[PDB]
mmCIF file of C-alpha atoms in Angstrom:
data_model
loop_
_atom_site.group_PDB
_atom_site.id
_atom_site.type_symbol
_atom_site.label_atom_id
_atom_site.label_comp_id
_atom_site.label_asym_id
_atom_site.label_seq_id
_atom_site.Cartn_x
_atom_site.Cartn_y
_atom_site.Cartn_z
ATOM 1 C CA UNK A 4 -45.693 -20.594 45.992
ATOM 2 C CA UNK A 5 -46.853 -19.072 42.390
ATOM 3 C CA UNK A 6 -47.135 -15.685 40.382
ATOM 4 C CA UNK A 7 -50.531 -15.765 40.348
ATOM 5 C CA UNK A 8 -52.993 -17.557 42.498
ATOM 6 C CA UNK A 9 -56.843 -17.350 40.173
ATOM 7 C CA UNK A 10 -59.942 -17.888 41.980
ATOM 8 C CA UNK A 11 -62.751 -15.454 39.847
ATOM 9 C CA UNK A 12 -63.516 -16.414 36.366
ATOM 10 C CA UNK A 13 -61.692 -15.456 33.040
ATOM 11 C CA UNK A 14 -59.002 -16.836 30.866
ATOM 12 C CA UNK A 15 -55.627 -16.226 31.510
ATOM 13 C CA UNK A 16 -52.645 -15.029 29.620
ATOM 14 C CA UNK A 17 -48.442 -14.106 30.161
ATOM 15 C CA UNK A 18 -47.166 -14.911 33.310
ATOM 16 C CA UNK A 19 -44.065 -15.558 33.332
ATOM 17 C CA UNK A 20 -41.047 -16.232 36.114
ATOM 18 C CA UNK A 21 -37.142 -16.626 34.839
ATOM 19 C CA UNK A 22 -34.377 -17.383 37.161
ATOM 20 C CA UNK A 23 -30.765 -16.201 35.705
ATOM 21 C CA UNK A 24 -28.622 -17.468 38.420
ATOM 22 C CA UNK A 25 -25.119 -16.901 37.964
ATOM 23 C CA UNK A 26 -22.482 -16.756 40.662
ATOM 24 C CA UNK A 27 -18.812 -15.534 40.161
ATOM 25 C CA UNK A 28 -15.687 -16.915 41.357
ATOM 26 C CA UNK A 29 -12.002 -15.690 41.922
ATOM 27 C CA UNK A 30 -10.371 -15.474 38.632
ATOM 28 C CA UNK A 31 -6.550 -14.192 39.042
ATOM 29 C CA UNK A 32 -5.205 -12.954 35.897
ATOM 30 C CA UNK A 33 -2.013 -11.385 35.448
ATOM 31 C CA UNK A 34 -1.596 -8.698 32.861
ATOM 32 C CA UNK A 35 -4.635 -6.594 31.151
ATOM 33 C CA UNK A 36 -7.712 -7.288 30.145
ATOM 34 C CA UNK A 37 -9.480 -4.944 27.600
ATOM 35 C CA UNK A 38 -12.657 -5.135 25.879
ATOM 36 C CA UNK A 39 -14.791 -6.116 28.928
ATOM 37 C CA UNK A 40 -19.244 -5.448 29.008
ATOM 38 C CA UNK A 41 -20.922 -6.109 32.360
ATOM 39 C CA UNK A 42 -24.564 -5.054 31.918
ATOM 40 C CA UNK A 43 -28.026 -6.190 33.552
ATOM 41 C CA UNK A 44 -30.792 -5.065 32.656
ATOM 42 C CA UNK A 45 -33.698 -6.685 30.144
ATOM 43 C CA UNK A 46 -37.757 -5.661 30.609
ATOM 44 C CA UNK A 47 -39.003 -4.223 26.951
ATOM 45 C CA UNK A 48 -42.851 -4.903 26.381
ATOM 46 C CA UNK A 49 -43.851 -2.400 24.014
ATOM 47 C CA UNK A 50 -47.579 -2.856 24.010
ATOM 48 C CA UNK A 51 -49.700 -5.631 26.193
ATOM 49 C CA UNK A 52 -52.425 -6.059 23.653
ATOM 50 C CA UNK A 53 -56.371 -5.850 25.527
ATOM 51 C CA UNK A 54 -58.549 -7.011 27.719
ATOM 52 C CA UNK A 55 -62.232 -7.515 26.923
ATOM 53 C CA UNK A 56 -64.855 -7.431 29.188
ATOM 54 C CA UNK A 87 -48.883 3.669 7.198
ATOM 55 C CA UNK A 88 -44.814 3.462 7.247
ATOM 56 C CA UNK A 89 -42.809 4.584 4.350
ATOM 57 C CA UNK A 90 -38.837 5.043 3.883
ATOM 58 C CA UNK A 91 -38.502 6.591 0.827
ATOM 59 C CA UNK A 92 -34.840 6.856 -0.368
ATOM 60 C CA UNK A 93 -32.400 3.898 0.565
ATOM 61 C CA UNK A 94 -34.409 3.656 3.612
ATOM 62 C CA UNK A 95 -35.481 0.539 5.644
ATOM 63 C CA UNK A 96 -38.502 -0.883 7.214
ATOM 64 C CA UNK A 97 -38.982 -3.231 10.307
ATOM 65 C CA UNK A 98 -36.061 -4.755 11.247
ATOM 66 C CA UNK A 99 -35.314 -5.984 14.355
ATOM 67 C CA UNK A 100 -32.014 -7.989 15.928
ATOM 68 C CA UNK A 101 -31.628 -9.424 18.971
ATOM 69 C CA UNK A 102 -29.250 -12.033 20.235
ATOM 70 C CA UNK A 103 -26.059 -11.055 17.829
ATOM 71 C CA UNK A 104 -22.129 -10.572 19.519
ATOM 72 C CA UNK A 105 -19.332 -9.709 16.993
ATOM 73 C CA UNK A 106 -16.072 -9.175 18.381
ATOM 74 C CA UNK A 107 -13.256 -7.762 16.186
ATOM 75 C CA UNK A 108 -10.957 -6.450 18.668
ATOM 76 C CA UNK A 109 -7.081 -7.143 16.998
ATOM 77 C CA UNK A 110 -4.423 -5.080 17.168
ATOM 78 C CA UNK A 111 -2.709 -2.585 15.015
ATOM 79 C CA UNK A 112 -5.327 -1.918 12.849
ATOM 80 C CA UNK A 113 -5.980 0.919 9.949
ATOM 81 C CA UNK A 114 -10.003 1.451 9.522
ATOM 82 C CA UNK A 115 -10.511 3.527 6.602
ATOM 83 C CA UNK A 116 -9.955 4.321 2.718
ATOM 84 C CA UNK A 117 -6.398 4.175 1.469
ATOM 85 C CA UNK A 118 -4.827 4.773 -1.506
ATOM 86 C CA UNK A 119 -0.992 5.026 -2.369
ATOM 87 C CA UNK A 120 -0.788 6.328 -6.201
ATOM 88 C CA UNK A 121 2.593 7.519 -6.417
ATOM 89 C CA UNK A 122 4.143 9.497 -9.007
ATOM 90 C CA UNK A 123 6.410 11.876 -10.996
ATOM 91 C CA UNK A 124 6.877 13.675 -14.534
ATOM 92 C CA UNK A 125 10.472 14.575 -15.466
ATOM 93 C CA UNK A 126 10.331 14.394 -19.086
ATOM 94 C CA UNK A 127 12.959 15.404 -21.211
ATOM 95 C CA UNK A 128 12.626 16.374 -24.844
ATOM 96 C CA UNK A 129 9.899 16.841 -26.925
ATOM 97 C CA UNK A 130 7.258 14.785 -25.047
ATOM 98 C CA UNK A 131 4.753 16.096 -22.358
ATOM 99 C CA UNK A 132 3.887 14.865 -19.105
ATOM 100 C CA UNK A 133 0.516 14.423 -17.648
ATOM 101 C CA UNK A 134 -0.977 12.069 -15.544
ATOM 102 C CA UNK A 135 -4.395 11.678 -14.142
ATOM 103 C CA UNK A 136 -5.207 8.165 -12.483
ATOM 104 C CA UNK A 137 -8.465 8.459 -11.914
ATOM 105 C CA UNK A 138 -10.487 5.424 -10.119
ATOM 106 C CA UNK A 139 -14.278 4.968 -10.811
ATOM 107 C CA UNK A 140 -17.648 6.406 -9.159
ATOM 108 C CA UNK A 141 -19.377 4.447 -6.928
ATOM 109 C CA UNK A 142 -22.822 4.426 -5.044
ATOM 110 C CA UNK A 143 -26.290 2.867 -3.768
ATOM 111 C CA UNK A 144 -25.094 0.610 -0.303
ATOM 112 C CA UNK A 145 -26.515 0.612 3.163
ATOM 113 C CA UNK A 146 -25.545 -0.757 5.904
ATOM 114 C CA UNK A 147 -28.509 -1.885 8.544
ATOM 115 C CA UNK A 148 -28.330 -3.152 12.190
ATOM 116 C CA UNK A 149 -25.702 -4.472 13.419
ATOM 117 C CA UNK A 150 -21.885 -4.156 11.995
ATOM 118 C CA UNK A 151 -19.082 -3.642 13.922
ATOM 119 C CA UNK A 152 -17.069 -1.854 10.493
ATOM 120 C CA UNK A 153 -20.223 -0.622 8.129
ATOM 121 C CA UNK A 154 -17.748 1.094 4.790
ATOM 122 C CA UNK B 4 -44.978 -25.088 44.117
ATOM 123 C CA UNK B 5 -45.776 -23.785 40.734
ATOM 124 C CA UNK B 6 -45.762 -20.361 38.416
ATOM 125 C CA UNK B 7 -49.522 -20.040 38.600
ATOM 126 C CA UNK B 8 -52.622 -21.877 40.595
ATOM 127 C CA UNK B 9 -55.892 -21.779 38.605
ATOM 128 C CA UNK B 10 -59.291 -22.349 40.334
ATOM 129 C CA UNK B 11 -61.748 -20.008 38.331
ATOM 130 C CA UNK B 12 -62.937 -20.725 34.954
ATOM 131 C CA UNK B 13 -60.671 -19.984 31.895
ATOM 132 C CA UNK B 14 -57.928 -21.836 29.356
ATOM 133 C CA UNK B 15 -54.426 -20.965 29.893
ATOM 134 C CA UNK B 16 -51.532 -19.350 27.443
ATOM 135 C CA UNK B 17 -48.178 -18.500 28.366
ATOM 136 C CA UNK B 18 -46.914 -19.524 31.668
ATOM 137 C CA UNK B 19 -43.264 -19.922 31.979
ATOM 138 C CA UNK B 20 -39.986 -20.761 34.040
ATOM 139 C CA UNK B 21 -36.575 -21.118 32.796
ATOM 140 C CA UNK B 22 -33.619 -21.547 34.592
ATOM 141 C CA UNK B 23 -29.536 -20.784 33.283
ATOM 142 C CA UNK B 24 -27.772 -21.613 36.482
ATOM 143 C CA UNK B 25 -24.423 -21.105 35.813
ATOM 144 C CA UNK B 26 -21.407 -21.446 38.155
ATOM 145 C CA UNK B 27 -17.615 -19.976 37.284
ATOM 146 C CA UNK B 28 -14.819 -20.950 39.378
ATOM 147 C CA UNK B 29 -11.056 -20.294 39.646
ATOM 148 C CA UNK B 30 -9.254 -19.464 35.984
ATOM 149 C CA UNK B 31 -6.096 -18.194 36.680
ATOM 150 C CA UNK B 32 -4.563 -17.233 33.178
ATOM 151 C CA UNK B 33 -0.880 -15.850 32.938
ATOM 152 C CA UNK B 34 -0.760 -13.242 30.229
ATOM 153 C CA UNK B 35 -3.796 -10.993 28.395
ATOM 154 C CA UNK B 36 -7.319 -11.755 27.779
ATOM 155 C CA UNK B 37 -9.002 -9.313 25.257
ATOM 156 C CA UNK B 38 -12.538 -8.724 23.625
ATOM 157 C CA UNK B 39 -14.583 -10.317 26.987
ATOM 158 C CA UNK B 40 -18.464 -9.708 27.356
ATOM 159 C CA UNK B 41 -20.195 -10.345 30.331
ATOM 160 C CA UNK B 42 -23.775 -9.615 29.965
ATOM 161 C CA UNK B 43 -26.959 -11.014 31.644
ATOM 162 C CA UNK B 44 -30.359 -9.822 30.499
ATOM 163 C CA UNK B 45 -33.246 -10.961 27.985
ATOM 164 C CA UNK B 46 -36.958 -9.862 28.996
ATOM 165 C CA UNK B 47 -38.906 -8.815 25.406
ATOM 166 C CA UNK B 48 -42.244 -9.002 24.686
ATOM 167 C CA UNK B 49 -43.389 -7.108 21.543
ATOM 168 C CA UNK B 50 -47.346 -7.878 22.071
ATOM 169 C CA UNK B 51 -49.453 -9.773 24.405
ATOM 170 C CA UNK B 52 -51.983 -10.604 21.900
ATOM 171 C CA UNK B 53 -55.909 -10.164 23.709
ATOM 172 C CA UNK B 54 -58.020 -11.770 26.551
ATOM 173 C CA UNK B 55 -61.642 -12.310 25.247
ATOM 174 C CA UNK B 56 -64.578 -12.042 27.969
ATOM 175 C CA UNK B 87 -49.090 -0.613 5.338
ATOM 176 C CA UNK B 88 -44.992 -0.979 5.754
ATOM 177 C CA UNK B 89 -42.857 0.074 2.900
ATOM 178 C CA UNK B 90 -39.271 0.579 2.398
ATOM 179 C CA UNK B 91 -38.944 2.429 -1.007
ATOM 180 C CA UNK B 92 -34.949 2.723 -2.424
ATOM 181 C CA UNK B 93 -32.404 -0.158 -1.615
ATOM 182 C CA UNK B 94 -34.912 -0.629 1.699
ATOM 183 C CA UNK B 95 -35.295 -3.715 4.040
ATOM 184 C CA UNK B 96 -38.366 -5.699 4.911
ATOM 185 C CA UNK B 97 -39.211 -7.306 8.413
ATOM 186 C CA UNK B 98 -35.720 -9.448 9.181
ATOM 187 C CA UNK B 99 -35.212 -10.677 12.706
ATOM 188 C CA UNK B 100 -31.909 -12.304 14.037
ATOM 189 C CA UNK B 101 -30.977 -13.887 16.910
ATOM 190 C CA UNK B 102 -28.330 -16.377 18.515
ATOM 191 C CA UNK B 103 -25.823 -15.949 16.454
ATOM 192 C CA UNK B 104 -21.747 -15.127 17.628
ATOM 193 C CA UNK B 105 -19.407 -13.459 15.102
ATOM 194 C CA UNK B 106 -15.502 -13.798 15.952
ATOM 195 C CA UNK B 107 -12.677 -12.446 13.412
ATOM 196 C CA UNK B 108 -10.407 -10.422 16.165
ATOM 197 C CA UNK B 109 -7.253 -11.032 13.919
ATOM 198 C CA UNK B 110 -3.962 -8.788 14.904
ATOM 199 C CA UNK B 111 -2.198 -6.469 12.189
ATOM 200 C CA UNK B 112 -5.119 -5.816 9.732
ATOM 201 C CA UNK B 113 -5.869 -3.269 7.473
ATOM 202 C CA UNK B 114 -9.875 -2.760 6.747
ATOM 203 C CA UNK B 115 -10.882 -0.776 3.914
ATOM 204 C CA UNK B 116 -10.535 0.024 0.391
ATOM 205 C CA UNK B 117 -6.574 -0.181 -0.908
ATOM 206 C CA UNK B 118 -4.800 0.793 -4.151
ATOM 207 C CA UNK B 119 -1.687 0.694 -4.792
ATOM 208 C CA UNK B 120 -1.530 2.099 -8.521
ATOM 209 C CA UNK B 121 2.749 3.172 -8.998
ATOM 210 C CA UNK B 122 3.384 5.529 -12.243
ATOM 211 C CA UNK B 123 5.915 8.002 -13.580
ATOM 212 C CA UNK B 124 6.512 10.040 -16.973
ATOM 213 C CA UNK B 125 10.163 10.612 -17.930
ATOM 214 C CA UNK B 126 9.844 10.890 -21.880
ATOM 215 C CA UNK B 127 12.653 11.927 -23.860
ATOM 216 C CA UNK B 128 11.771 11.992 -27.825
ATOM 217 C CA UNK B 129 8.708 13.015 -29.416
ATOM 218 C CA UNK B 130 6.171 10.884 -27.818
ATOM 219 C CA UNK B 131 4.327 12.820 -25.126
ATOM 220 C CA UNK B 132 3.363 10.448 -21.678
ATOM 221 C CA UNK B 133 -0.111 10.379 -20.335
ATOM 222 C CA UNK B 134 -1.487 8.060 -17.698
ATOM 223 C CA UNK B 135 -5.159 7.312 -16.578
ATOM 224 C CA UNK B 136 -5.095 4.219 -14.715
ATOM 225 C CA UNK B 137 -8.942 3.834 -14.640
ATOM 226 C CA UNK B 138 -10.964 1.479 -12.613
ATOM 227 C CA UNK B 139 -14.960 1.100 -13.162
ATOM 228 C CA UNK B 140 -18.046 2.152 -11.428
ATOM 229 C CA UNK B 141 -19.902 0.089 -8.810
ATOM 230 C CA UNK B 142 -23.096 0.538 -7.278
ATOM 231 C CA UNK B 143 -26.511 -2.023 -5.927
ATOM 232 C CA UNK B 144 -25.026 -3.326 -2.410
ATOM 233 C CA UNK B 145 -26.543 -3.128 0.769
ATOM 234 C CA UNK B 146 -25.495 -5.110 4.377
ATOM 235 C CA UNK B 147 -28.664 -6.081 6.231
ATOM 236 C CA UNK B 148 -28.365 -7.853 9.508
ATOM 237 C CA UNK B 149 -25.319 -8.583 11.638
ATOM 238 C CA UNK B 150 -22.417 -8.885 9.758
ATOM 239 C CA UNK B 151 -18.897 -7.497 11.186
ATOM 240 C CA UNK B 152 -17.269 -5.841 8.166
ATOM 241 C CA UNK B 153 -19.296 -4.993 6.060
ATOM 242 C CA UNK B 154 -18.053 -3.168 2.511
ATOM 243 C CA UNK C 4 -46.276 -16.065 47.891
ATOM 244 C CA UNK C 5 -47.331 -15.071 44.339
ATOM 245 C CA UNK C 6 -47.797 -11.464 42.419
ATOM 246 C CA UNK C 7 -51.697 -11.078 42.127
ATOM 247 C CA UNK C 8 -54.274 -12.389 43.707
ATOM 248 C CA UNK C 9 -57.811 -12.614 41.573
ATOM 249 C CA UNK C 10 -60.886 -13.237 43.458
ATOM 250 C CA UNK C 11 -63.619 -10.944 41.605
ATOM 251 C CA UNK C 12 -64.355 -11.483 38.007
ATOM 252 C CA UNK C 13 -62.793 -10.831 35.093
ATOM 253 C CA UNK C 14 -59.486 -12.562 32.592
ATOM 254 C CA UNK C 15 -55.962 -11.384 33.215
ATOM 255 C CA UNK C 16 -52.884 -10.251 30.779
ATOM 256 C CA UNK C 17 -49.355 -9.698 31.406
ATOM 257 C CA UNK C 18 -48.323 -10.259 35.106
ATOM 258 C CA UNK C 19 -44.335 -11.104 35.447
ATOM 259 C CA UNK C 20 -42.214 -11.785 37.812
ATOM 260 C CA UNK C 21 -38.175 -11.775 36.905
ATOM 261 C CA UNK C 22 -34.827 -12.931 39.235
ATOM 262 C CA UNK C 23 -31.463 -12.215 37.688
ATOM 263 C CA UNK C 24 -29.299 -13.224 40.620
ATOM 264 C CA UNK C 25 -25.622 -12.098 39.819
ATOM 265 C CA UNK C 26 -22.670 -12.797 42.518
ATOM 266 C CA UNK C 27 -19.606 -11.699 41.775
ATOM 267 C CA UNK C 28 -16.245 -12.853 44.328
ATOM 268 C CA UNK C 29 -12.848 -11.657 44.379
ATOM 269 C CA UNK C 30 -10.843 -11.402 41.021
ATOM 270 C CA UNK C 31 -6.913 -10.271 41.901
ATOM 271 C CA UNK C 32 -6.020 -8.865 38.030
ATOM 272 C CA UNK C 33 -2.354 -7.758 38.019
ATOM 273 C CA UNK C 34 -1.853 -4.900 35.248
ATOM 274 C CA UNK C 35 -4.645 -3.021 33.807
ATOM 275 C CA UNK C 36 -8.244 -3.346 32.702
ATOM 276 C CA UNK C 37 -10.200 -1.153 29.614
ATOM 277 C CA UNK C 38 -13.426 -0.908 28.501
ATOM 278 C CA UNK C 39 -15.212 -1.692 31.202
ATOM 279 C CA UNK C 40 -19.291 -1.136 31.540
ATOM 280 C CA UNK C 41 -21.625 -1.627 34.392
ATOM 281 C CA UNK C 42 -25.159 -1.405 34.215
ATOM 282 C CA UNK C 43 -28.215 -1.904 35.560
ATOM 283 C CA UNK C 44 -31.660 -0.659 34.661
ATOM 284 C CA UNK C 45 -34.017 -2.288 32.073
ATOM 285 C CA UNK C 46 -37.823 -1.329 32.157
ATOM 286 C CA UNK C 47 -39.698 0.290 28.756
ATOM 287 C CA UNK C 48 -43.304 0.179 28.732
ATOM 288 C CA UNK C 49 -44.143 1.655 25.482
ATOM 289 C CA UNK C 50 -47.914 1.126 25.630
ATOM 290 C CA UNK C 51 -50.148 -1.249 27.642
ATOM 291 C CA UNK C 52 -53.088 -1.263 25.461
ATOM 292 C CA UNK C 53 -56.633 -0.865 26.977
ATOM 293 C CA UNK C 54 -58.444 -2.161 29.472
ATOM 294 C CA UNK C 55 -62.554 -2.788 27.998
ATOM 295 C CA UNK C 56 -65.723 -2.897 30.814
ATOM 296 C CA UNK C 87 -48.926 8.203 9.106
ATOM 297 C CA UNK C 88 -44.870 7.876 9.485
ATOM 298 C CA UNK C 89 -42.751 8.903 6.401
ATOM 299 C CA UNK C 90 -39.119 9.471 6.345
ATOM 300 C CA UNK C 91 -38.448 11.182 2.646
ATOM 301 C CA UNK C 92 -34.817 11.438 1.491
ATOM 302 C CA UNK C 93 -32.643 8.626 2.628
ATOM 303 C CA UNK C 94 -34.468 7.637 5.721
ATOM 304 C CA UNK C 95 -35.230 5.250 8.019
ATOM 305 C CA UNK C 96 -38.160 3.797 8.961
ATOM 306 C CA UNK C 97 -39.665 1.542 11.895
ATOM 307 C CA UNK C 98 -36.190 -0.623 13.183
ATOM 308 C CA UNK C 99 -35.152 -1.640 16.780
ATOM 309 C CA UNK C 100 -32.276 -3.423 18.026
ATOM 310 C CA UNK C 101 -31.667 -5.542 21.253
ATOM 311 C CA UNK C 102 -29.287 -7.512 22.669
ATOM 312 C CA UNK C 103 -26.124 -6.887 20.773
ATOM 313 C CA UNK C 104 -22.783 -6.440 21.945
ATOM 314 C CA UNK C 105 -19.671 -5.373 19.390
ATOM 315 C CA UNK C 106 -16.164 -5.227 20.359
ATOM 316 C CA UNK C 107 -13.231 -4.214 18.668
ATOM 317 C CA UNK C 108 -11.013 -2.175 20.972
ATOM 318 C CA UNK C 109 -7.894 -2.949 19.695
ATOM 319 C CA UNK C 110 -4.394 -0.663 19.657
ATOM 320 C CA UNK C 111 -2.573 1.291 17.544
ATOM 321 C CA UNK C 112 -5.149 2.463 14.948
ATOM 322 C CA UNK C 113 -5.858 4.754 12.349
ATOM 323 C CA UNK C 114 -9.948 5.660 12.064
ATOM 324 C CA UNK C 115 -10.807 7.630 8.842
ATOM 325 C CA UNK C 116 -10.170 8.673 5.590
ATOM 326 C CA UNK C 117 -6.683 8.364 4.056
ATOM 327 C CA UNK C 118 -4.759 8.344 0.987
ATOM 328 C CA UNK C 119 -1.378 8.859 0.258
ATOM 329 C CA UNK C 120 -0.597 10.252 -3.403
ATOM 330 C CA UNK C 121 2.663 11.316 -4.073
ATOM 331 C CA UNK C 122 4.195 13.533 -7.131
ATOM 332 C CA UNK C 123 6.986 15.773 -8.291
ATOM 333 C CA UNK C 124 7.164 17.721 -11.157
ATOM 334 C CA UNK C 125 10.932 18.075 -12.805
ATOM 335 C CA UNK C 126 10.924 18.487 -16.528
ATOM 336 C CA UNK C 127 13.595 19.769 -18.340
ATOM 337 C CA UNK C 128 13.338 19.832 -22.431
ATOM 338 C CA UNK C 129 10.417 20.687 -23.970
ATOM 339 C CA UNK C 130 7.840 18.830 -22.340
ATOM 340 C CA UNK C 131 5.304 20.433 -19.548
ATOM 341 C CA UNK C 132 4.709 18.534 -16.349
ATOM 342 C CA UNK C 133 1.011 18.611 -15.414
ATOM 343 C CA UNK C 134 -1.064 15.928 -12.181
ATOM 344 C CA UNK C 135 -4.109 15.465 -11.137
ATOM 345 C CA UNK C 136 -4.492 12.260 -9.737
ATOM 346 C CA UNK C 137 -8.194 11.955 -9.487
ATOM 347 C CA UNK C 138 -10.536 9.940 -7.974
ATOM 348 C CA UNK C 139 -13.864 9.594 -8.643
ATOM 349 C CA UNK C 140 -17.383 10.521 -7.131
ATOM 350 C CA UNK C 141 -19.759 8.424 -4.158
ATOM 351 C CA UNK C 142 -22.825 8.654 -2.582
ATOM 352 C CA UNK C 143 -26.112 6.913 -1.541
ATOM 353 C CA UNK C 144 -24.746 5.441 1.587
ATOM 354 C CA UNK C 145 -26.356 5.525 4.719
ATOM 355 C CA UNK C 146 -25.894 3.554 8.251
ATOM 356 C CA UNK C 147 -28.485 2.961 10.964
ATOM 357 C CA UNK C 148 -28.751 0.687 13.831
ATOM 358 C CA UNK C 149 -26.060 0.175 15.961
ATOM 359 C CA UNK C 150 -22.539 -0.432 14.088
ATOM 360 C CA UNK C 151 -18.781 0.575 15.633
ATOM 361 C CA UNK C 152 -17.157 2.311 13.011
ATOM 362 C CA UNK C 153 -19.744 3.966 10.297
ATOM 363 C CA UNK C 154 -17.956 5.483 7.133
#
């Protein structure tokens, strides 16, 4: 009853065992649900290490970052996701004037957005 | 009854159990349920370390962050995300005056979102 | 009953064992369910090391980032995605004016998403 059972020599090192037990029910909704994530799957071990016996982001780029852990949920309802702008206008002039208009706004620059967002803008 | 049984020679590191035993039952909710995860899976291990027997982001750039455990909720119903103006002009000049309109703003720049945010702008 | 058995000589490194025991029942939703994902496969292995007996993203990019375990909803109904703007102009003189629009904006740049976001504009 173990992972491992050691009888030579040497020092040991990750052994692990993890148990997620989780056990359903009936539920018994009436209507919709929406917005709904069933996934199972986690074993990432990007390098073991051993046994004995140079990065550069140049423009507005990022370097080793890493998230884990991290829900955001957002969902609503009726929802506009973008720029907007509502300049309205009109000239009708009448005499000795001269109608011009231009409403201009502004430049605008330098912003990231890393990881995780939901709406990055 | 154990994770690992050690006879040999050696010191020990990581050995591990964990548990999250986690039981639903009956719900049995009359209407809508939105924005529902259901996920079940955490196994990462960057680096083991070892048994014995140069990172640069340049422009606006990010530097070794790491999140976890953390829940964002802002669902919200009838919102409007992202930039909004609602500048209103007309002309109509009727002398000797002469009716010009600009309606400037400004520059912006330096802003970056790093991590796990939601909306991020 | 383990995963390895060591008799000869020599230390050990990563050797897991991992249980994620999911039962679902019966549910009985009346209506309609969206957004719905079911998976199951996790194992990356990037390197295991060894056994003993020059990166450079230029303009605007990116550089050494991963992301785990991060879930983002935000289904939602009824929405506009994208760029929008709603100017609005008519002309009419009459005298001795000239009706002339232009309604500008103004320039942007230097933006740039990575990671894992939703909506990225």
């Amino acid at each position: 009853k173990a992972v491992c059972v050691l009888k030579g020599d040497g020092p040991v090192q990750g052994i692990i065992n993890f148990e997620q037990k989780e056990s359903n029910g009936p539920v018994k909704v009436w209507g919709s649900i929406k917005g709904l994530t069933e996934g199972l799957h986690g074993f990432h071990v990007h390098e073991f290490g051993d046994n004995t016996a140079n990065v550069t982001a140049d423009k507005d780029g990022v370097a080793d970052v890493s998230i884990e852990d991290s829900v955001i949920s957002l969902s609503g309802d009726h929802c506009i996701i973008g720029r907007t702008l509502v300049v309205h206008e009109k000239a009708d002039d009448l005499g000795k004037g001269g109608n011009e208009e231009s409403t201009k706004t502004g430049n605008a620059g330098s912003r990231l957005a890393c990881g995780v967002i939901g709406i990055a803008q």
